Amino acid sequence: EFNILLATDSYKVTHYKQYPPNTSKVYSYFECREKKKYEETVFYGLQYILNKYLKGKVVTKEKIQEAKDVYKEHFQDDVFNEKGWNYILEKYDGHLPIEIKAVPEGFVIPRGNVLFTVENTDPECYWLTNWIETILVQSWYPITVATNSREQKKILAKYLLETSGNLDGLEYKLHDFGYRGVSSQETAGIGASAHLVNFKVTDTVAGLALIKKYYGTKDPVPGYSVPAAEHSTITAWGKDHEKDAFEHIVTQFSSVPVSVVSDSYDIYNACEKIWGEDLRHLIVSRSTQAPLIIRPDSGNPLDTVLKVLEILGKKFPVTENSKGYKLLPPYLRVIQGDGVDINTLQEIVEGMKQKMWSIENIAFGSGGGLLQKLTRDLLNCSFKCSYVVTNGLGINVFKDPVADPNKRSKKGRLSLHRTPAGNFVTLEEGKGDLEEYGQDLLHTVFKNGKVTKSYSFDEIRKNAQLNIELE
């Protein structure tokens, strides 16, 4: 079972001995710090953490003793605030005396703004605010996946609108293939859920149960997939029988969309000769609702996509849409699912546009690039103490390292507001109390062991919409 007393960075066990004596309040905040592009971030994932790890009775006698035993050996010393944890157990039935205020999930906020704040609600527990830094800071991950996925959606939307005149199918154009490429089962669920803020296609099944349990949707599920081959289901037929494998697979799945990996031996031959000649009669008969989706999986992503489109354009009847771009017949599409990240996605759609191919023709699959190749440094996700009360006096505190102004932190009590022009501003030093800027956009989401405000996944998706979608 999970033990909150063992879910912090080891050194934090020692901090209750290090704060100024007579400190009754420690107040801290999280931001995606501005860096002298990712100019705005999607706030998402805190609700998972609050419910799974922070709410209710999280302290017991047994958990205190377990932590005491471990820390004794881990430090080779007895440092451990047993009294402080016993107080929470006895006075609050093991519920954390902490208040967290947060911007609503799904909100899209420019860099350098307060996204949530944390403070103790009982003077005895001044040390607890930063105990839970480690677990709260892991919100960097769903924030960053959601943000990077949304930035890819912006690229897709721009190029889809330009080459086709509309955004039809946009939510189905970036498919999460990252289950095997992330570092754990838990990561898989969190990351997949964050991608579903922006799109509706995933093979990372773990995301669905997370959303159902912690957020919820009106629809039965938040994300969908379609039948698809992998190299094993092609290669198992033997080298000389790739055509037999293809025929078997498209016939088994004759009335739904089906994706077929086509580069086991020679992607160009498969497209031109197997699909384009031997099995053409099985492709041109398919429904618009059940296309064959050809899947290259190797070679230079841009070069390969363009050559695949060139081959198919010569074997199948291509039309020219009203924007002047070429379009494959509706029973035939392509998905590029190798080597896709935000940079290569951009290169591919631009290369397609230059060669006059509509983005209607293609979808992308991304795995490691979508869910694993991301770090806390990307958006400078960071949690810092900005205000303490010592001897009954509040003081505004901060760091400001001489050699790195980008690491300077905010001072005092913070609040988030709309500006007169409709943008966002973070007010420092308790200046939100002057009430010159309308209502604080942070809301209490957790107080004294209870989750006090929750969002559905539908609301989160609404908050995270692109401007181009709004228009």
Which residues belong to the annotated binding site? Answer: 180, 203, 231, 295-297, 337-338, 368, 376
- Residue 286 near residue 254 (C-beta atoms within 8 A): yes
- Residue 24 near residue 126 (C-beta atoms within 8 A): yes
Query: 184: how many CB neighbours lie within 10 A of its CB?
Result: 9
Give whichever of 297 and 359 is closer to a second copy, judged by the CB atom.
Answer: 297
Residue 384 beta carbon to a second copy: minimum distance, rounded to whole angstroms: 7
Residue 407 beta carbon to a second copy: minimum distance, rounded to whole angstroms: 6
The helix/strand/coil state of 260 is: strand
Give whichever of 141 and 364 is closer to a second copy, judged by the CB atom.
Answer: 141
CA distance 200 to 222: 6
Residue 470 beta carbon to a second copy: minimum distance, rounded to whole angstroms: 28
CA distance 457 to 441: 19
Give whichever of 353 and 407 is closer to a second copy, judged by the CB atom.
Answer: 407
Please report, in range form, the residues annotated as the binding site for diphosphate. 180, 231, 295
Q: Phi/psi class of residue 391: alpha, beta or left (left: φ > 0; alpha: ψ in -120 to 50)?
A: left
- Residue 424 near residue 113 (C-beta atoms within 8 A): yes
CA distance 129 to 10: 15
Give whichever of 397 and 464 is closer to a second copy, judged by the CB atom.
Answer: 397
- DSSP notation for 80-110: --HHHHHHHHHHHTT---EEEEEPPTT-EEE
CA distance 39 to 34: 8
Rounded alpha-carbon distances, angstroms, from residue 141 to 205, 430, 454: 18, 29, 20
Give whichever of 2 and 285 is closer to a second copy, judged by the CB atom.
Answer: 2
Give whichever of 209 and 356 is closer to a second copy, judged by the CB atom.
Answer: 209
Residue 232 beta carbon to a second copy: minimum distance, rounded to whole angstroms: 4
Residue 87 beta carbon to a second copy: minimum distance, rounded to whole angstroms: 20
Please report, in range form, the residues annotated as the binding site for beta-nicotinamide D-ribonucleotide. 203, 295-297, 337-338, 368, 376
- Residue 365 near residue 340 (C-beta atoms within 8 A): yes
Under DSSP, the state recorded for 349 is H
- Residue 346 near residue 314 (C-beta atoms within 8 A): no
Residue 422 beta carbon to a second copy: minimum distance, rounded to whole angstroms: 33
Residue 256 beta carbon to a second copy: minimum distance, rounded to whole angstroms: 5
Give whichever of 94 and 223 is closer to a second copy, judged by the CB atom.
Answer: 223
- In this structure, what token pair is assigned to residue 159? 């190029």
